[PDB]
Amino acid sequence: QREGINASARYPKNWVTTGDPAREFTMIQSAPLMLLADPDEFVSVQLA
Amino acid sequence: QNLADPAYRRRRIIMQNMRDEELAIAQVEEMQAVSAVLKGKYTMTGEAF
Amino acid sequence: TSKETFTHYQPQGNSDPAHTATAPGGLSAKAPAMTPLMLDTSSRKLVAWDGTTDGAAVGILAVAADQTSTTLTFYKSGTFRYEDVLWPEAASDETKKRTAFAGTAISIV
Amino acid sequence: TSKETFTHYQPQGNSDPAHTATAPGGLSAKAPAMTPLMLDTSSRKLVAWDGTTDGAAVGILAVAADQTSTTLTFYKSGTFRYEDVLWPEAASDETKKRTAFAGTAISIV
Amino acid sequence: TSKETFTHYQPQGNSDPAHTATAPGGLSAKAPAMTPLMLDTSSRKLVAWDGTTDGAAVGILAVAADQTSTTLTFYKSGTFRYEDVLWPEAASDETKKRTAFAGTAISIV
């Protein structure tokens, strides 16, 4: 929201926590929604 | 024979991690398509999801 | 037509951090999120909080689960609004309801 | 003439966060702020922690309160100095005086 | 010939913060760093966690210490992994070992 970048493929980010633990972190986020318009276009034959 | 900066070592750890998340994400990216055009039925289910 | 009252998504009542933990669940029926918890009497396995066992609240559920779910995630820290909590029916007295989490970091705000 | 000591305010001991929470209180007299508290036995209503009931220390008040104070604000996280917090004299044994807060996230540093 | 697998050490289980504190301890033998502990039932003195009583594990150590160590530095928040933490053989049923830190910000992953 702060960059208005909710709509994207992926999302990199880096940050760090303060206090006597000096620890950075890296963070990646995305919402994979892979779909197919014609589901019956393909026939999944389980060969035997 | 030739050591280096732990700080630069920190950078290399950072970049290898970067490649790690990229590969991990792309791996589920293929998994989604595998389920999709392998069954036409799919379950996006995991812990904390 | 009809009324359209919609509310935002912030159950938090304070800027205090909220922390979660995962533990194997032993439910007997479906339990949606924000459901309190007990440990059993003998196996002390995870079940939903009854509302009658004093001090037995051990966690508040994070995501919806059921008896099929072997393990569950539950919030463990911070303060949350009373209005958003799904209190059990046996928890009939608010005077004893507010301090169900006595001795724990989960708090009602 | 006469010299006076102007000293800073350092109740904390380390950079750990300090969190507050509210719950209705059932005091028996005036209770100054930053005071140990337990719950009762029958209704487990909020009261000041006596100093003799082991394992009952669960909270440290935030604002001074009384009979008219229906509710209490109290600190739930962090570590605070040994010296600064005022305890009942019934807590007469020092070794259990440190360990009164067993199981709690609030600590004595 | 020789294999020295350069592996890392990540006792922290999740990015949630871990808090530390100190308190006098009454151990009976050497206690390896980051080891579960209880409070005594007689004098309420810091003791080693037996692994037999459920829900009495209250703290995890920070630095190496022995029974000679009068005071102990121990962690009281955060999440840590299944693997890195050391358990006595007394705690044998693993699902029981899951809920040793129930009610505490110290959490198992």
Coordinates of C-alpha atoms in Angstrom, one line a residue:
Chain A
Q1 CA 0.0 0.0 0.0
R2 CA 2.7 2.5 0.9
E3 CA 4.1 2.3 -2.7
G4 CA 0.7 1.3 -4.1
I5 CA 2.4 -1.7 -5.6
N6 CA -0.1 -4.4 -4.6
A7 CA -0.5 -5.5 -8.2
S8 CA 2.8 -7.0 -9.3
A9 CA 4.5 -10.3 -10.3
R10 CA 6.8 -10.5 -7.3
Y11 CA 7.9 -8.3 -4.4
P12 CA 11.4 -8.0 -3.0
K13 CA 12.0 -6.3 0.3
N14 CA 14.9 -5.9 2.9
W15 CA 14.8 -4.7 6.4
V16 CA 16.4 -5.0 9.8
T17 CA 15.4 -5.3 13.5
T18 CA 17.0 -3.0 16.1
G19 CA 18.0 -3.7 19.7
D20 CA 20.9 -5.6 20.9
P21 CA 20.2 -8.3 18.2
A22 CA 21.6 -6.7 15.0
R23 CA 19.7 -8.8 12.5
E24 CA 18.7 -8.0 8.9
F25 CA 16.2 -10.0 6.9
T26 CA 15.2 -10.4 3.3
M27 CA 11.6 -10.9 2.3
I28 CA 10.0 -11.9 -1.0
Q29 CA 6.2 -12.0 -1.6
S30 CA 3.9 -12.9 -4.6
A31 CA 0.5 -14.4 -5.2
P32 CA 0.8 -17.2 -7.8
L33 CA -2.6 -17.7 -9.5
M34 CA -1.7 -19.7 -12.6
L35 CA -4.8 -20.7 -14.5
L36 CA -6.1 -22.1 -17.8
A37 CA -9.0 -20.7 -19.8
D38 CA -9.9 -24.0 -21.6
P39 CA -9.6 -26.7 -18.9
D40 CA -10.9 -29.5 -21.2
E41 CA -8.5 -28.6 -24.0
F42 CA -6.0 -31.2 -22.7
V43 CA -6.6 -34.9 -22.0
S44 CA -4.5 -36.4 -19.1
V45 CA -4.1 -40.1 -20.2
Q46 CA -2.6 -42.1 -17.3
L47 CA -0.5 -44.6 -19.3
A48 CA -0.1 -48.1 -18.0
Chain B
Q1 CA 45.3 -19.4 0.8
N2 CA 43.2 -16.4 0.2
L3 CA 40.5 -15.4 2.7
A4 CA 38.1 -12.4 2.4
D5 CA 35.9 -10.0 4.2
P6 CA 33.2 -11.5 6.4
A7 CA 31.3 -8.3 5.3
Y8 CA 31.8 -9.3 1.7
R9 CA 31.0 -12.8 2.8
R10 CA 27.8 -11.3 4.1
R11 CA 27.1 -9.9 0.7
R12 CA 27.7 -13.3 -0.9
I13 CA 25.4 -14.9 1.6
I14 CA 22.8 -12.3 0.7
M15 CA 23.1 -12.9 -3.1
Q16 CA 23.0 -16.7 -2.7
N17 CA 19.9 -16.3 -0.5
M18 CA 18.4 -14.1 -3.3
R19 CA 18.9 -16.8 -5.8
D20 CA 17.5 -19.3 -3.3
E21 CA 14.1 -17.4 -3.0
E22 CA 13.9 -17.0 -6.7
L23 CA 14.4 -20.7 -7.3
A24 CA 12.0 -21.6 -4.5
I25 CA 9.2 -19.4 -5.9
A26 CA 9.8 -20.5 -9.4
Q27 CA 9.6 -24.1 -8.2
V28 CA 6.0 -23.7 -6.9
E29 CA 5.3 -21.7 -10.1
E30 CA 5.9 -24.9 -12.0
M31 CA 4.0 -26.9 -9.4
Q32 CA 0.9 -24.9 -10.0
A33 CA 1.0 -25.5 -13.8
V34 CA 1.8 -29.1 -13.2
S35 CA -1.4 -29.6 -11.2
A36 CA -3.3 -27.4 -13.6
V37 CA -2.4 -29.2 -16.8
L38 CA -2.0 -32.5 -15.1
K39 CA -5.5 -33.0 -13.5
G40 CA -7.6 -29.9 -14.0
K41 CA -8.0 -30.2 -10.2
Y42 CA -5.8 -28.6 -7.7
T43 CA -5.4 -27.9 -4.0
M44 CA -3.4 -24.9 -2.8
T45 CA -3.0 -26.0 0.8
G46 CA -0.2 -25.8 3.3
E47 CA 0.5 -24.8 6.9
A48 CA -0.5 -21.2 7.7
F49 CA -2.5 -21.3 4.5
Chain C
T1 CA -32.0 -1.6 -2.0
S2 CA -30.3 -2.5 1.3
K3 CA -27.7 -1.1 3.7
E4 CA -24.0 -1.7 3.0
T5 CA -22.1 -1.3 6.2
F6 CA -18.6 -2.5 5.6
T7 CA -15.7 -2.5 8.2
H8 CA -11.9 -2.4 7.8
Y9 CA -9.5 -5.3 8.5
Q10 CA -7.7 -4.4 11.8
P11 CA -8.7 -6.5 14.7
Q12 CA -5.7 -5.2 16.6
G13 CA -6.4 -2.8 19.4
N14 CA -2.8 -1.8 20.0
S15 CA 0.4 -1.5 17.9
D16 CA 1.8 -4.4 20.0
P17 CA 3.3 -7.2 17.9
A18 CA 1.3 -10.4 17.3
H19 CA 3.1 -13.7 17.5
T20 CA 2.1 -17.1 16.2
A21 CA 3.1 -20.7 17.0
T22 CA 2.4 -24.1 15.5
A23 CA 1.5 -27.2 17.4
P24 CA -0.2 -30.5 16.6
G25 CA -4.0 -30.2 17.0
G26 CA -6.4 -32.8 18.3
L27 CA -9.8 -31.2 17.5
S28 CA -13.0 -33.3 17.2
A29 CA -14.9 -30.8 15.1
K30 CA -14.2 -27.9 12.7
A31 CA -12.9 -24.8 14.5
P32 CA -12.6 -21.5 12.7
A33 CA -9.8 -19.0 13.4
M34 CA -9.8 -16.8 16.5
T35 CA -10.9 -19.8 18.6
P36 CA -9.4 -20.4 22.1
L37 CA -7.6 -23.5 23.1
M38 CA -7.0 -26.0 26.0
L39 CA -4.7 -28.9 26.6
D40 CA -6.3 -32.3 27.3
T41 CA -6.4 -33.8 30.8
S42 CA -4.2 -36.8 30.1
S43 CA -2.5 -36.5 26.7
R44 CA -2.8 -32.6 27.0
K45 CA -3.4 -32.6 23.2
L46 CA -4.8 -29.4 21.7
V47 CA -8.5 -28.9 21.8
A48 CA -10.7 -25.8 21.7
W49 CA -11.2 -23.9 25.0
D50 CA -14.5 -24.8 26.7
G51 CA -15.2 -21.6 28.5
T52 CA -15.5 -23.4 31.9
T53 CA -12.0 -24.6 32.7
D54 CA -10.3 -21.8 34.6
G55 CA -7.0 -20.6 33.3
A56 CA -7.0 -23.3 30.5
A57 CA -6.8 -20.8 27.7
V58 CA -3.4 -21.5 26.0
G59 CA -3.8 -19.9 22.6
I60 CA -6.2 -18.2 20.1
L61 CA -6.5 -19.8 16.7
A62 CA -4.9 -18.1 13.7
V63 CA -6.3 -19.9 10.7
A64 CA -9.4 -22.0 10.4
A65 CA -9.0 -25.7 11.0
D66 CA -10.9 -28.9 11.8
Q67 CA -10.4 -32.4 13.3
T68 CA -8.7 -33.5 10.1
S69 CA -5.9 -30.9 10.7
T70 CA -3.1 -32.7 12.5
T71 CA -1.3 -29.4 13.4
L72 CA -2.6 -25.8 13.8
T73 CA -1.2 -22.3 14.0
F74 CA -2.4 -19.9 16.8
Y75 CA -1.6 -16.4 17.9
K76 CA 0.4 -16.2 21.1
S77 CA 1.1 -12.5 21.8
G78 CA -0.4 -9.1 21.8
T79 CA -3.8 -7.5 22.6
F80 CA -6.9 -8.0 20.5
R81 CA -10.4 -6.5 20.4
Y82 CA -13.1 -8.3 22.4
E83 CA -15.6 -7.8 19.7
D84 CA -13.7 -10.0 17.2
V85 CA -13.3 -13.0 19.5
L86 CA -15.4 -16.1 19.0
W87 CA -16.0 -16.9 22.7
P88 CA -17.4 -20.4 23.5
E89 CA -20.9 -20.8 24.6
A90 CA -19.9 -22.2 28.0
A91 CA -18.0 -19.0 28.5
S92 CA -21.2 -17.2 29.6
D93 CA -19.8 -14.7 32.1
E94 CA -17.7 -11.7 30.7
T95 CA -16.3 -11.0 34.2
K96 CA -14.6 -14.4 34.0
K97 CA -14.2 -14.1 30.2
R98 CA -11.9 -11.2 30.0
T99 CA -9.1 -12.8 32.1
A100 CA -9.3 -16.3 30.5
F101 CA -5.7 -15.6 29.4
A102 CA -4.3 -15.0 32.9
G103 CA -0.6 -15.5 33.0
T104 CA -0.2 -15.3 29.2
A105 CA 0.8 -12.7 26.6
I106 CA -2.6 -12.9 24.8
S107 CA -4.7 -10.1 26.1
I108 CA -8.2 -8.5 25.5
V109 CA -8.2 -4.8 24.7
Chain D
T1 CA 21.6 26.7 51.9
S2 CA 20.5 23.1 51.0
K3 CA 21.3 21.0 48.0
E4 CA 18.8 18.7 46.3
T5 CA 19.5 15.7 44.0
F6 CA 17.9 16.0 40.5
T7 CA 18.0 12.5 39.1
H8 CA 16.8 11.0 35.8
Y9 CA 14.0 8.4 35.4
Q10 CA 15.2 4.9 34.4
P11 CA 12.6 2.2 35.4
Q12 CA 13.7 0.0 32.6
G13 CA 16.8 -2.2 32.7
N14 CA 17.4 -3.0 29.0
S15 CA 16.1 -2.0 25.6
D16 CA 13.3 -4.7 25.8
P17 CA 9.8 -3.5 24.9
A18 CA 7.2 -2.9 27.6
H19 CA 3.6 -3.7 26.8
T20 CA 0.4 -2.6 28.7
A21 CA -3.0 -4.2 29.1
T22 CA -6.2 -3.5 30.9
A23 CA -8.6 -5.6 32.9
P24 CA -11.1 -4.7 35.7
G25 CA -9.6 -4.7 39.2
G26 CA -11.0 -5.7 42.6
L27 CA -8.6 -4.0 45.0
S28 CA -9.1 -4.1 48.8
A29 CA -7.4 -0.7 49.4
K30 CA -5.5 2.0 47.6
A31 CA -2.9 0.4 45.4
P32 CA -0.1 2.7 44.0
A33 CA 1.0 2.1 40.4
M34 CA 3.7 -0.4 39.4
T35 CA 2.5 -2.9 42.1
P36 CA 2.4 -6.8 41.8
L37 CA -1.0 -8.3 41.3
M38 CA -2.7 -11.7 41.2
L39 CA -6.2 -13.0 40.5
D40 CA -8.6 -14.2 43.3
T41 CA -9.6 -17.8 43.9
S42 CA -13.4 -17.8 43.6
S43 CA -14.0 -15.5 40.7
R44 CA -10.3 -15.1 40.2
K45 CA -11.0 -11.4 40.3
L46 CA -8.0 -9.0 40.0
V47 CA -6.4 -8.1 43.3
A48 CA -2.9 -7.1 44.6
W49 CA -0.5 -10.0 44.9
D50 CA -0.1 -10.8 48.5
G51 CA 3.5 -11.8 48.8
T52 CA 2.7 -15.3 50.1
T53 CA 0.8 -17.0 47.3
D54 CA 3.5 -18.6 45.3
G55 CA 3.2 -18.4 41.5
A56 CA 0.3 -15.9 41.6
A57 CA 2.4 -12.9 40.5
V58 CA 1.0 -12.2 37.0
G59 CA 1.0 -8.4 36.5
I60 CA 2.5 -5.1 37.4
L61 CA 0.1 -2.1 37.6
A62 CA 0.6 1.0 35.5
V63 CA -1.6 3.7 37.1
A64 CA -2.4 4.1 40.8
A65 CA -5.9 2.7 41.6
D66 CA -8.4 2.3 44.4
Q67 CA -11.9 0.9 45.2
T68 CA -13.5 3.3 42.6
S69 CA -11.0 2.1 40.0
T70 CA -13.1 -0.6 38.3
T71 CA -10.4 -1.3 35.8
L72 CA -6.6 -1.6 35.9
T73 CA -3.8 -0.8 33.5
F74 CA -0.7 -3.0 33.9
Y75 CA 2.5 -3.8 32.2
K76 CA 2.9 -7.1 30.4
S77 CA 6.3 -7.2 28.8
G78 CA 9.9 -6.3 29.4
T79 CA 12.3 -6.3 32.4
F80 CA 12.4 -3.7 35.1
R81 CA 14.9 -3.0 37.9
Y82 CA 15.0 -4.8 41.2
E83 CA 15.1 -1.5 43.1
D84 CA 12.3 0.5 41.5
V85 CA 9.2 -1.7 42.0
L86 CA 7.4 -1.5 45.4
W87 CA 6.4 -4.9 46.8
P88 CA 4.2 -6.0 49.7
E89 CA 6.1 -6.7 52.9
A90 CA 4.5 -10.2 53.1
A91 CA 7.0 -11.1 50.4
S92 CA 9.7 -11.5 53.1
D93 CA 11.9 -14.2 51.5
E94 CA 14.3 -12.7 48.9
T95 CA 15.1 -15.9 46.9
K96 CA 11.4 -16.4 46.1
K97 CA 11.2 -12.6 45.7
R98 CA 13.1 -12.7 42.5
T99 CA 11.2 -15.8 41.3
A100 CA 7.7 -14.5 41.9
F101 CA 7.0 -14.0 38.2
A102 CA 7.5 -17.6 37.0
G103 CA 5.9 -18.2 33.7
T104 CA 5.4 -14.5 32.9
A105 CA 7.0 -12.3 30.2
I106 CA 7.5 -9.5 32.7
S107 CA 10.8 -9.9 34.5
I108 CA 13.1 -8.4 37.1
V109 CA 16.5 -7.3 35.9
Chain E
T1 CA 39.2 -38.0 2.2
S2 CA 38.0 -36.0 5.2
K3 CA 34.6 -34.2 5.0
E4 CA 34.0 -31.1 7.1
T5 CA 30.6 -30.0 6.0
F6 CA 30.6 -26.3 6.6
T7 CA 27.1 -25.9 8.0
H8 CA 25.6 -22.9 9.6
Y9 CA 24.0 -22.5 13.1
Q10 CA 20.5 -21.0 13.3
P11 CA 19.1 -21.7 16.7
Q12 CA 16.5 -19.0 16.1
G13 CA 13.4 -20.5 14.6
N14 CA 11.6 -17.4 13.3
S15 CA 12.3 -13.7 12.9
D16 CA 10.2 -13.0 16.0
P17 CA 12.3 -11.3 18.7
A18 CA 14.0 -13.3 21.5
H19 CA 14.3 -11.7 25.0
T20 CA 16.8 -12.4 27.7
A21 CA 16.9 -12.1 31.5
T22 CA 18.9 -13.2 34.5
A23 CA 18.0 -14.8 37.8
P24 CA 19.9 -16.8 40.5
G25 CA 20.0 -20.5 39.9
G26 CA 20.3 -23.6 42.0
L27 CA 21.5 -26.3 39.6
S28 CA 23.0 -29.6 40.7
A29 CA 25.4 -30.4 37.8
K30 CA 26.7 -28.9 34.6
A31 CA 24.0 -27.3 32.4
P32 CA 24.8 -26.9 28.7
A33 CA 24.0 -23.5 27.2
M34 CA 20.4 -23.2 26.0
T35 CA 18.9 -25.9 28.1
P36 CA 15.3 -26.1 29.5
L37 CA 14.8 -25.3 33.2
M38 CA 12.2 -25.1 35.9
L39 CA 11.5 -23.4 39.2
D40 CA 11.9 -25.3 42.4
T41 CA 8.7 -26.4 44.2
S42 CA 10.2 -26.0 47.7
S43 CA 12.4 -22.9 47.7
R44 CA 11.4 -21.6 44.2
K45 CA 15.0 -21.7 43.1
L46 CA 16.1 -22.2 39.5
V47 CA 16.5 -25.9 38.7
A48 CA 17.0 -28.0 35.7
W49 CA 13.9 -29.1 33.7
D50 CA 13.3 -32.8 34.5
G51 CA 11.3 -33.7 31.4
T52 CA 8.8 -35.6 33.5
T53 CA 6.3 -33.0 34.7
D54 CA 4.4 -31.3 31.9
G55 CA 4.1 -27.6 31.4
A56 CA 6.8 -26.7 34.0
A57 CA 9.5 -25.9 31.4
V58 CA 9.8 -22.1 31.8
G59 CA 13.1 -21.0 30.5
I60 CA 16.0 -21.8 28.1
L61 CA 19.6 -21.0 28.9
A62 CA 22.0 -18.6 27.0
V63 CA 25.6 -19.2 28.1
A64 CA 27.4 -22.3 29.5
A65 CA 27.0 -22.7 33.2
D66 CA 27.2 -25.3 36.0
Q67 CA 25.8 -25.8 39.5
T68 CA 28.6 -23.5 40.5
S69 CA 26.8 -20.7 38.6
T70 CA 24.8 -18.9 41.2
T71 CA 23.0 -16.8 38.6
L72 CA 21.8 -17.8 35.1
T73 CA 21.3 -15.8 31.9
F74 CA 18.3 -17.2 30.0
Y75 CA 16.0 -16.5 27.1
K76 CA 12.3 -15.8 27.5
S77 CA 10.9 -15.0 24.1
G78 CA 11.0 -15.9 20.4
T79 CA 10.8 -19.1 18.3
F80 CA 13.4 -21.8 18.0
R81 CA 13.6 -24.9 15.9
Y82 CA 12.9 -28.5 16.8
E83 CA 16.5 -29.6 16.2
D84 CA 19.0 -27.3 17.9
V85 CA 17.5 -27.6 21.4
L86 CA 18.6 -30.3 23.8
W87 CA 16.2 -32.4 25.8
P88 CA 16.7 -34.9 28.6
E89 CA 15.8 -38.5 28.0
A90 CA 13.0 -38.3 30.5
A91 CA 10.8 -36.4 28.1
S92 CA 10.0 -39.3 25.8
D93 CA 6.6 -38.7 24.2
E94 CA 7.3 -36.1 21.6
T95 CA 3.8 -34.6 21.2
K96 CA 4.1 -34.0 25.0
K97 CA 7.4 -32.3 24.3
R98 CA 5.7 -29.9 21.9
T99 CA 3.6 -28.2 24.6
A100 CA 6.3 -27.7 27.2
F101 CA 6.4 -23.9 26.6
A102 CA 2.7 -23.4 26.4
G103 CA 1.6 -20.1 27.8
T104 CA 5.1 -18.6 27.0
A105 CA 6.5 -16.5 24.2
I106 CA 9.2 -19.1 23.9
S107 CA 7.8 -21.2 21.0
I108 CA 8.6 -24.4 19.1
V109 CA 9.0 -24.7 15.3

